[PDB]
Symmetry: C4
């Protein structure tokens, strides 16, 4: 039986490193999104019976740890176009895989919503009485993509992602810094998981916990074709572009904050 | 006194590796079930006073860590017939111990319910007024075995275990993969504990947190003879077979998802 | 200034290993009790405003980790007369330090209540209106020592500690087993902290989280002389002796469960 | 592109070790305060909808872990003038950097409030209806700095910080003790994070979780000029000086408790 298993391994082997890493990014984001949006569905469809907002933070924080362990060796498990932007901005990785990773991250995050929707098919439909509504007392689209609260405005909503992404970049850069090793090597999976955990508890009130263009726009495109319709994009004065443009500008904002004070002054 | 202790060690020693590993599986599942169903009793019999649903997730997630530390070296602490099925499916372990482990896992999970029932004897009887009812406002049988919610249907209830088991297999396979080591070796106990933790927070709303045939059918057989009666099996249109057949088909569904994208493309 | 610090180090140095270890046990239990009973006061005096029962489990579980790190190298940080009983029962430690550790554990747990009482002096007095009552709607003595619930009886209350202590011993023995090392050495502090964490979430409903004669009877003697009076001992049909005699008989009950199935069958 | 990045690294390099460490302290406290006061804003401005008090403890506890990982190698990430006082008190560090670190810790904690205020600009203003009030049913200044509760008095409020700081010092000293290594080296970031976690759950009811002069007085100076006014300092009979003087006297109170019992009696 072992020979049969070994024979199948050599048949589907691909010698292309770029293609091998793109596949690991599709699975890395699929695990993160399915365990991320799946937890939000648990505390939204149950009206808080099966957990509060701390369940979302623990699940989102520890899903990054699992996604990194799954695909960390193959590609590094960036799981974030903003994170991939920072690595390419520091000459740590070529620019030719910036769109390759993004296409393999947006797709895979789109699949992560499909698994959640098929997992909560009856709960989602019966939440609002066989109808799908983007947001409100019976809103359902907020499970997959993040939406602003009532108090949020456009100007401050932009700066929530900029601050959230900048804090993530500074903490992530210190962990993945070769010259900064305050912990034994190999604990990158656990250390990053805490970073995403405290982000949800700290800055996860205005709109949610996106801090990633793929995790936000990925499942959002799924909800548009899943029954919610065009109302997904036009909610809150075209909110869809805020969690994409802002984190990209927040990635380079965490490089300037970190490198100018710790990264450059290291031996 | 040391000589007396050493003398007793040589008297009960068995040289059979297969028997030695089966005993470690009985204790591994007993610890997992007792700490798993014991936590559910805490938040059900107390009506949420002594904790919410996050207590169940933390206890279930960290009971696997303790059960692995107890029996990891002796047998590996599969604690799941679906997990044991995947290992035998990848030629990592002989097929002759698939029924041996299952018999030593179902038994041991049955004992894990007996310890919980004797631990909460007065609370269980006085929960519904000296009567035992399978489910409802005063239901008690839901502590040991998992039962579907009102919104759950048969078709989607089948796919909850398939999705839950597939996600577990992909994350577990990456951890126990010899060629995939993104973390220093020996942290298998901690990494697996997080996998079961996020499963409860993500997909623990429709029916509960079973994702294991032994943890579901094990204590369920105990409740049938403990006073609940035949109503345990026939609740929800013969729900008992769903958390057994589906995870078995979900174990091979996580092998195809993981190996075809990460496992095969590794050196 | 360094010479002055070095001079003071040699003045108070004691060459007695037994005395040096007893001092580390007084601090190990003081840290555990102060952080244990301090957390219970937070969720009792605030009526759940500043946390639920999960706060108690996290604080009690992670206080053992801190207490072990403080005194693990000096003496091992047993922090439990039942745990010390098991070690002496397996010839791992001489019987002459069983009463020495117990006296240094009960004292030190008594001090751990004094720090908490002085920390919450106004909250405790004003909780019931300048009066001290053992238990009830305004009870205060339940913060330090554990008391049975209304549903609890004498027979089952005895077996809660026996089951709770036996589960602790099996998990602790596997961690401290020289021949059972499923995790890299040195992680004893973290692994034990999870064991006490899941005990509170699983079997912390009937009476509380004692599973230790020193943590239960230690601060209980403090409450008797702190204003509560003789009502502390006579509550619930002389409940004071149950969390002392039962865990002692539960320590040898975890040795027989563990050694007969895993410990003896190891190389 | 790599040459351009390397050229910029050599341009802004400073060869002064004292200045390099001060910059790492500004970022270490900025990360701690922003993730600390940011979490308090989440559970205060949302009226508990987005989390309870356990969210504050988890975020405050794990922010110290992230701040240590960011600046641990550069300077050690004291993040606390009381902690820096203890190190200088044990001849482990020169006295000339006691005011340098404090100035680089108070500043940086002041910035940590500015990021939070800009992150929650609409929520803070609309919390009380376009008005800023120090404390009360609609109070807002309690997010940044800690304020006493109604039951708290002046005498016991002083001893809360003394007990809270002394417990922190004893646990921190044992971790950073070269002669006390019960855990493999390099886990200082994780072990310290648990110490601050249990402090919030244990002694975070009377006033809050300050146990640090920079985290308390830092953002408090920000609130005075941000609209709250002079009422910040004069609330609760000049409460501002209590969380500064008391922790300083509690730092030397943890040295005498720890060194006299464990630290001195070590080889
Ligand atoms: C809700 C949203 C959640 C968002 C979560 C975001 C998680 C971000 C995790 C960042 C992980 C970065 O991981 C880091 O990647 C870089 C990529 O060059 C790796 O870098 C290494 O490998 C790559 C190839 O993979 C080499 O080209 C490079 O020279 C080498 O240094 C690091 O070894 C790894 O530690
Ligand atoms: C609520 C339900 C909770 C469900 C929790 C399920 C937990 C699942 C844990 C899976 C643990 C698998 O653990 C993994 O087992 C395989 C079994 O071959 C071991 O494999 C190793 O040992 C076995 C013998 O034990 C050898 O035959 C094999 O060649 C060798 O590689 C791995 O070293 C171990 O890491
Ligand atoms: C709410 C209640 C909470 C209860 C928490 C209880 C915590 C229990 C922790 C148990 C720790 C045991 O720790 C274990 O102690 C034994 C004691 O012989 C040590 O054993 C070692 O040191 C001792 C001296 O210290 C030697 O005599 C012995 O030969 C050697 O093996 C182990 O190296 C240590 O790992
Ligand atoms: C809400 C408030 C939160 C408060 C949180 C407080 C966190 C406190 C963390 C304390 C960290 C101390 O960290 C410890 O610092 C000392 C400082 O000499 C370092 O000491 C080492 O480096 C320094 C230079 O940096 C040398 O001069 C010294 O000889 C050497 O031993 C230790 O290697 C480090 O482990």
């Amino acid at each position: 039986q072992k020979e049969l298993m070994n024979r199948c391994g050599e048949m589907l082997h691909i010698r292309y490193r770029l293609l091998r890493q793109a596949l690991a990014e599709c699975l890395g984001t699929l695990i993160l999104v399915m365990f991320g949006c799946g937890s939000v569905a648990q505390v939204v469809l149950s009206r808080g019976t099966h957990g509060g907002f701390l369940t979302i933070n623990l699940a989102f924080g520890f899903a990054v740890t699992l996604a990194i362990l799954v695909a960390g060796q193959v590609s590094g498990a960036h799981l974030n176009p903003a994170v991939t932007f920072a690595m390419c901005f520091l000459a740590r990785e070529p620019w030719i895989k910036l769109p390759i990773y993004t296409l393999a991250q947006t797709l895979g995050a789109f699949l992560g919503a499909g698994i959640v929707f098929g997992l909560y098919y009856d709960a989602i439909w019966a939440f609002a009485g066989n109808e799908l509504v983007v947001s409100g007392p019976n809103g359902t689209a907020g499970i997959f993509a993040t939406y602003p609260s009532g108090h949020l405005d456009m100007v401050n909503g932009f700066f929530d992602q900029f601050i959230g992404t900048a804090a993530l970049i500074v903490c992530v850069l210190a962990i993945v810094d070769p010259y900064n090793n305050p912990v034994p090597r190999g604990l990158e999976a656990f250390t990053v998981g805490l970073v995403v955990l405290v982000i949800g508890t700290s800055m996860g009130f205005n709109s949610g916990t996106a801090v990633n263009p793929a995790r936000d726009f990925g499942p959002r495109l799924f909800t548009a074709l899943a029954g919610w319709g065009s109302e997904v994009f036009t909610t809150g004065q075209n909110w869809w572009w805020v969690p994409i443009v802002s984190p990209l500008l927040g990635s380079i904002g965490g490089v300037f904050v970190y490198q100018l004070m710790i990264g450059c002054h290291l031996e």
